[PDB]
Enzyme design. Structure first.
Site, PDB file in Angstrom:
ATOM      1  N   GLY A   1      37.344  48.201  40.061  1.00 51.72           N
ATOM      2  CA  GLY A   1      36.838  48.305  41.319  1.00 51.72           C
ATOM      3  C   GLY A   1      38.248  48.803  42.617  1.00 51.72           C
ATOM      4  O   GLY A   1      39.184  47.999  42.096  1.00 51.72           O
ATOM      5  N   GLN A   2      37.607  49.416  43.350  1.00 54.65           N
ATOM      6  CA  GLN A   2      38.772  50.058  44.248  1.00 54.65           C
ATOM      7  C   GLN A   2      38.036  49.627  45.671  1.00 54.65           C
ATOM      8  O   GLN A   2      36.894  50.331  46.096  1.00 54.65           O
ATOM      9  CB  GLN A   2      38.741  51.545  44.258  1.00 54.65           C
ATOM     10  CG  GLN A   2      40.020  51.999  44.837  1.00 54.65           C
ATOM     11  CD  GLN A   2      40.433  53.347  44.542  1.00 54.65           C
ATOM     12  OE1 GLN A   2      39.582  54.249  44.135  1.00 54.65           O
ATOM     13  NE2 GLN A   2      41.800  53.733  44.715  1.00 54.65           N
TER      14      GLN A   2
ATOM     15  N   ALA B   1      39.289  48.216  49.964  1.00 53.57           N
ATOM     16  CA  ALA B   1      40.041  48.085  51.144  1.00 53.57           C
ATOM     17  C   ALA B   1      41.397  47.352  51.088  1.00 53.57           C
ATOM     18  O   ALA B   1      42.427  47.718  51.093  1.00 53.57           O
ATOM     19  CB  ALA B   1      39.508  48.029  52.475  1.00 53.57           C
TER      20      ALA B   1
ATOM     21  N   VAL C   1      41.560  46.248  41.741  1.00 51.51           N
ATOM     22  CA  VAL C   1      41.500  45.581  40.600  1.00 51.51           C
ATOM     23  C   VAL C   1      41.622  46.415  39.074  1.00 51.51           C
ATOM     24  O   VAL C   1      40.630  47.155  39.145  1.00 51.51           O
ATOM     25  CB  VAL C   1      40.246  44.873  40.654  1.00 51.51           C
ATOM     26  CG1 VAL C   1      40.060  43.823  39.436  1.00 51.51           C
ATOM     27  CG2 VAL C   1      40.000  43.838  41.767  1.00 51.51           C
TER      28      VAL C   1
ATOM     29  N   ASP D   1      29.649  37.528  52.832  1.00 53.47           N
ATOM     30  CA  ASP D   1      28.962  38.607  52.215  1.00 53.47           C
ATOM     31  C   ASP D   1      28.556  38.600  50.986  1.00 53.47           C
ATOM     32  O   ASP D   1      29.666  38.276  50.116  1.00 53.47           O
ATOM     33  CB  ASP D   1      30.153  39.952  52.539  1.00 53.47           C
ATOM     34  CG  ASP D   1      29.457  41.172  51.679  1.00 53.47           C
ATOM     35  OD1 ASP D   1      28.349  41.874  51.841  1.00 53.47           O
ATOM     36  OD2 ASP D   1      30.266  41.429  50.683  1.00 53.47           O
TER      37      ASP D   1
HETATM   38  N1  LIG Z   1      37.030  40.098  37.665  1.00 53.61           N
HETATM   39  C1  LIG Z   1      36.500  41.260  37.561  1.00 53.61           C
HETATM   40  N2  LIG Z   1      36.133  41.648  36.364  1.00 53.61           N
HETATM   41  C2  LIG Z   1      35.545  42.827  36.526  1.00 53.61           C
HETATM   42  O1  LIG Z   1      35.420  43.554  35.072  1.00 53.61           O
HETATM   43  C3  LIG Z   1      34.857  44.946  34.989  1.00 53.61           C
HETATM   44  C4  LIG Z   1      34.706  45.555  33.872  1.00 53.61           C
HETATM   45  C5  LIG Z   1      33.809  46.870  33.541  1.00 53.61           C
HETATM   46  C6  LIG Z   1      33.468  47.560  34.865  1.00 53.61           C
HETATM   47  C7  LIG Z   1      32.908  48.823  34.375  1.00 53.61           C
HETATM   48  C8  LIG Z   1      32.023  49.129  33.264  1.00 53.61           C
HETATM   49  C9  LIG Z   1      31.210  50.391  33.126  1.00 53.61           C
HETATM   50  S1  LIG Z   1      31.591  51.420  34.562  1.00 53.61           S
HETATM   51  O2  LIG Z   1      30.372  52.520  34.387  1.00 53.61           O
HETATM   52  O3  LIG Z   1      32.721  52.074  34.494  1.00 53.61           O
HETATM   53  C10 LIG Z   1      31.245  50.627  35.831  1.00 53.61           C
HETATM   54  C11 LIG Z   1      32.454  49.365  35.919  1.00 53.61           C
HETATM   55  C12 LIG Z   1      33.816  47.054  36.228  1.00 53.61           C
HETATM   56  C13 LIG Z   1      34.437  45.563  36.184  1.00 53.61           C
HETATM   57  C14 LIG Z   1      34.873  45.021  37.631  1.00 53.61           C
HETATM   58  O4  LIG Z   1      34.473  45.764  38.556  1.00 53.61           O
HETATM   59  C15 LIG Z   1      35.180  43.790  37.623  1.00 53.61           C
HETATM   60  C16 LIG Z   1      35.642  42.991  39.018  1.00 53.61           C
HETATM   61  C17 LIG Z   1      36.127  41.665  38.906  1.00 53.61           C
HETATM   62  C18 LIG Z   1      36.535  41.163  40.091  1.00 53.61           C
HETATM   63  O5  LIG Z   1      36.755  40.080  40.316  1.00 53.61           O
HETATM   64  O6  LIG Z   1      36.379  41.747  41.352  1.00 53.61           O
END
Ligand SMILES: Nc1nc2oc3ccc(C4CCS(=O)(=O)CC4)cc3c(=O)c2cc1C(=O)O
Length: 602
Positions: A17-18, A20, A24, A128
């Site tokens: 995730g990208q 502001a 991550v 949010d």
């Molecule tokens: N703890 C967190 N683990 C996270 O594991 C993630 C594992 C995978 C993916 C992708 C799978 C297929 S894909 O189509 O590439 C779309 C996204 C995203 C995340 C993710 O965004 C994420 C955020 C947090 C947080 O804490 O914000």
């Protein structure tokens, strides 16, 4: 090239995730190899971060530790990795384009409610709450587990200038779409978006502007495309409507929210299929409620009177005691429910669904246009693939319910013969015991009455063997037509649609990757174009097979069902009257078996 820490390291390509504040990355540990979610800040903390470490809950992403990067000495948060993505990622798949699965929807509501309650017990406001703030982890049992982590479309009307974004999320997860959308989306029509929220309609939960600068189509109920059961919509609608209005005077608050949500989650499901209406239902009833309240919910969902509800289960009749608790009901599934039939004639409706057509495909080579086009069209085929499996289920449930009901009618007929032999034996042993003994008017009046009984008793026997001839193979009431009209699992129609669906999804997932890349090479450009044309021939081939085979055979089966329902309701009224004509004469022969057969004399 990549950044590292004393215990962790992550590549800049494996980005998740990208945002502001920070970005991550997907990183590993230097000593274990286990995967973690590494949060690197682009730019008071040592206390507010260590208090988030002790936060331990199933619906909250665990903050493991806080380390400092090697090169930039940036504060790095080591968090729990959720390989499935966020709730937004889940809602991006075409199968959830028109709403989450009903079971998956309950998991979201349980984790979301269970997560915020643990945050309110500690005093953390989320401000949010969107599908982006809700991650998904696969549990040890294979079922999804959703967790909160990070603490324009999900803003309160007064904040636009807490329970609001929760209502928008639950509506988004239930319909597969946002509750308040202008025409050209919440972008330049952003002032329309604010006019939509300040409209304060209260009871309504949706507002669709289907024309540029046009009106706003309000509604208080869920759309027809909603993949939740009608019984779940009835319990979900008042929860959202009371948390989707700017009036704090009319806002619920967390306590009434947590109370009414806990009420829904504590209810078990009783699957019921209205055999005469050709409709399947789900009764959300508490395990401590009585069967009387169960019949009430069936009436509110089928308009069948509680006393007229006759229930069938596993090939036999089912009698529900009015005080029998719901947790003692037999376990039911969507494929083995409790068939409800009524003596009153019922309208045969069938399944009601929103009839959507394929949106046209544009020839403009647009990486963003083809992606947004491929997403909507694949969700349509999923909806057509969803309705196709539901129509097949309705027909196969119809065949079992009819093949059972004819055996239950043949059981009522066999009980009538038992009471017929009890009357024929009494008739003969009383009409002949008088002949043995045979002042004349006291005996001739009996034979003018005993012969009227055996004559009217015989007409019952003739009209009974007529019904036995109707419940026989090919006797103008056989269930053979049900096997030779609609669709069957042998035709494999649901799978034939699922084949074209995966090809459309692989093309969609590729166009989703084609959009990430800003431009394609000449070779890759022609593959993006060639498969864009195959996306049309797959959707056109599927819609042809859906309407010209699944719908036609279904409506031919349903039309044949409405006629057979009448012919069945007709035979039930005769057999009921023919059995009532056996009970009243079973007692009419009781007035004469003890009358003259036992005179008085010392
Ligand atoms: N703890 C967190 N683990 C996270 O594991 C993630 C594992 C995978 C993916 C992708 C799978 C297929 S894909 O189509 O590439 C779309 C996204 C995203 C995340 C993710 O965004 C994420 C955020 C947090 C947080 O804490 O914000």
């Amino acid at each position: 090239a990549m950044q590292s820490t004393s215990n962790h390291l992550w590549l800049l390509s494996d980005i998740l995730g990208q945002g502001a504040t920070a970005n991550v990355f997907r990183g590993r540990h230097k000593k274990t190899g286990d995967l973690f979610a590494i949060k690197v800040f682009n730019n008071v903390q040592m206390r507010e971060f260590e208090v988030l470490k002790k936060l331990n809950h199933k619906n909250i992403v665990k903050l493991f530790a806080i380390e400092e990067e090697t090169t930039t000495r940036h504060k790095v948060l080591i968090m729990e990795f959720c390989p499935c993505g966020s709730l937004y990622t889940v809602l991006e798949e075409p199968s959830n384009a028109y709403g989450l699965p009903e079971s998956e929807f309950l998991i979201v509501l349980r984790d979301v409610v269970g997560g915020m309650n643990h945050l309110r017990e500690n005093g953390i406001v989320h401000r949010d709450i969107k599908p982006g703030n809700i991650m998904r982890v696969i549990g040890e049992d294979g079922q999804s587990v959703y967790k909160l982590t990070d603490f324009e479309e999900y803003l309160h009307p007064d904040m636009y200038e807490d329970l609001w974004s929760i209502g928008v999320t639950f509506y988004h997860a239930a319909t597969g779409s946002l509750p308040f959308r202008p025409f050209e989306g919440p972008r330049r029509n952003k002032e329309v978006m604010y006019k939509i929220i300040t409209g304060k309609p209260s009871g309504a939960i949706s507002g669709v502007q289907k024309a540029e600068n046009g009106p706003i189509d309000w509604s208080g109920d869920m759309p027809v495309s909603c993949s939740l059961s009608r019984g779940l919509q009835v319990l979900l609608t008042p929860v959202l409507a009371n948390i989707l209005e700017a009036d704090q005077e009319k806002c619920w608050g967390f306590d009434q929210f947590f109370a009414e949500t806990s009420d829904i989650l504590h209810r078990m499901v009783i699957h019921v299929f209205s055999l005469q209406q050709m409709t399947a239902h789900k009764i959300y009833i508490h395990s401590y409620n009585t069967a009387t309240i169960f019949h009430e919910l069936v009436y509110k969902q089928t308009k069948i009177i509680s006393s007229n509800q006759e229930l069938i289960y596993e090939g036999r009749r089912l009698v529900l005691e009015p005080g029998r608790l719901a947790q003692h009901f037999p376990k039911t599934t969507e494929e083995n429910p409790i068939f409800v039939v009524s003596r009153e004639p019922l309208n045969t409706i069938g399944l009601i669904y929103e009839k959507i057509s394929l949106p046209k495909v544009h020839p403009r080579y647009d990486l963003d246009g083809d992606a947004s086009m491929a997403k909507a069209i694949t969700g349509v085929v999923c909806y057509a693939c969803r309705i196709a499996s539901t129509l097949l289920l309705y027909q196969e449930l119809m065949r079992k319910g009819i093949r059972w009901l004819i055996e239950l009618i043949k059981d009522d007929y066999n009980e009538t013969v038992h009471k017929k032999t009890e009357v024929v034996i009494t008739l003969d042993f009383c009409i002949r015991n008088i002949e043995k003994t045979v002042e004349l008017g006291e005996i001739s009046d009996i034979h003018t009455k005993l012969l009227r009984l055996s004559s009217s008793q015989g007409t019952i026997e003739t009209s009974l063997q007529d019904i036995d001839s109707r419940l026989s193979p090919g006797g103008s009431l056989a269930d053979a037509w049900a096997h030779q009209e609609g669709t069957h699992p042998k035709d494999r129609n649901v799978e034939k649609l699922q084949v074209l669906l995966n090809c459309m999804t692989e093309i969609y997932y590729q166009f989703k990757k084609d959009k990430a890349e800003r431009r394609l090479a000449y070779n890759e450009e022609q593959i993006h174009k060639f498969d864009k044309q195959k996306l049309y021939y797959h959707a056109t081939k599927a819609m042809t097979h859906f309407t010209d085979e699944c719908v036609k055979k279904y409506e031919a089966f349903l039309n044949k069902s409405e006629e057979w329902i009448r012919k069945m309701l007709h035979l039930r009224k005769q057999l009921l009257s023919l059995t009532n004509q056996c009970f009243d004469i079973e007692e009419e022969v009781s007035k004469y078996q003890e009358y003259t057969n036992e005179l008085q004399e010392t």
